[PDB]
Amino acid sequence: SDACVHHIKRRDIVLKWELGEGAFGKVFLAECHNKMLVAVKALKEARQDFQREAELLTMLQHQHIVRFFGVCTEGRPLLMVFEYMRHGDLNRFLRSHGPDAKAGGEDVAPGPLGLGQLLAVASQVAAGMVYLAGLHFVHRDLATRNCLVGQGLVVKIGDFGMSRDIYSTDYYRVGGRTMLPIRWMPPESILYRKFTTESDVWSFGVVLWEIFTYGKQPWYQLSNTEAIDCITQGRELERPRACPPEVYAIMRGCWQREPQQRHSIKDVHARLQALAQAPPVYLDVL
Ligand SMILES: Cc1cn(-c2cc(NC(=O)c3cc4cc(c3C)C#Cc3cnc5ccc(nn35)N(C)CCNC(=O)CCCCO4)cc(C(F)(F)F)c2)cn1
Numbered sequence: 001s002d003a004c005v006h007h008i009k010r011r012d013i014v015l016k017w018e019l020g021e022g023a024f025g026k027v028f029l030a031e032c033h034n035k036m037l038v039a040v041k042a043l044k045e046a047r048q049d050f051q052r053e054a055e056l057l058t059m060l061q062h063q064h065i066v067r068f069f070g071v072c073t074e075g076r077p078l079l080m081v082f083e084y085m086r087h088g089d090l091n092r093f094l095r096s097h098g099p100d101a102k103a104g105g106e107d108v109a110p111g112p113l114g115l116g117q118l119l120a121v122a123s124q125v126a127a128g129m130v131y132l133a134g135l136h137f138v139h140r141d142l143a144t145r146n147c148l149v150g151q152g153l154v155v156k157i158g159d160f161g162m163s164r165d166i167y168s169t170d171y172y173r174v175g176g177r178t179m180l181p182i183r184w185m186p187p188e189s190i191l192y193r194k195f196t197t198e199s200d201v202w203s204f205g206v207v208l209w210e211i212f213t214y215g216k217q218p219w220y221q222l223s224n225t226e227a228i229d230c231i232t233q234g235r236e237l238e239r240p241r242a243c244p245p246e247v248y249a250i251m252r253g254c255w256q257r258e259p260q261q262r263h264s265i266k267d268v269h270a271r272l273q274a275l276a277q278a279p280p281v282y283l284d285v286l
Pocket of ligand 1: 019020021022023024025026027039041053056057060065066082083084085086088089139148157158159160161162
């Protein structure tokens with residue numbers, strides 16, 4: 001126990017209703033009195049994996065990492081208190097604001113999401129990955145499904161959380177047990193099965209691809225085995241229609257076969273941030 005986790009009395013937590021069910025956890029919408037709304041995670045049992053995660057969740061504090069408030073161990077089931085993100089995960093957000101579904105909102109225009117919005121969303125995910133790469137933390141399952149959207153179009157990296165139970169189609173089940181998001185995985189992670197920070201920047205290019213594709217699954221064209229091949233033979237994803245050539249260069253910069261030939265996430269974020277606050281007339285031409 002290197003760091004210490006804050007604790008929240010069970011009297012403070014008042015469960016309203018469920019937000020989703022997982023194979024190992026349950027997310028309820030609840031209130032805390034430290035009065036705001038929070039998202040609590042109930043363990044379905046793993047107690048060692050509870051404290052270990054909380055210790056790691058506490059150390060990770062940033063503007064684009066899901067805000068961890070603490071735990072509650074004064075009565076089973078054990079709880080993990082997260083902040084509430086209004087628009088759910090990024091993948092379900094992107095899809096519901098694409099040209100495919102089916103009328104404005106409070107945080108977003110009628111849609112589809114314009115270039116300025118997509119660049120804004122992309123920069124926030126990139127900014128959060130620089131922090132993780134700065135701590136040399138390796139997020140081995142980077143995708144739009146594992147990013148949350150809050151009130152005000154703020155994007156934070158959230159889940160894992162039963163993403164292998166919700167989006168089971170995004171994972172290849174290796175052997176009898178264990179799933180791999182091979183469509184988001186780099187060649188060295190498929191072949192030699194090695195994961196690094198440079199293996200994450202590959203995943204971000206795939207994440208950056210999802211954004212300008214409005215939530216579609218990468219290599220939706222293919223099956224799991226065919227997707228493995230195309231990545232193995234070094235076949236790249238084609239530039240999505242909503243993506244300008246200026247941004248597709250950033251994707252390919254994340255898709256170099258040699259992991260060290262790939263650009264740093266600090267450099268990728270630098271390009272994405274600059275394009276975000278860029279004046280209208282500069283983006284209209286893009
Ligand atoms: C090896 C390792 C990795 N980690 C690690 C863990 C996390 N954890 C995480 O992001 C994490 C984990 C988690 C839940 C949430 C997050 C953010 C959340 C949330 C949240 C806030 N508002 C809403 C509204 C609807 C909604 N969720 N939701 N759903 C749609 C229900 C989801 N349905 C379910 O069934 C999930 C079951 C248990 C889920 O546990 C985050 C990080 C990171 F990336 F942020 F650092 C790292 C710990 N150890």
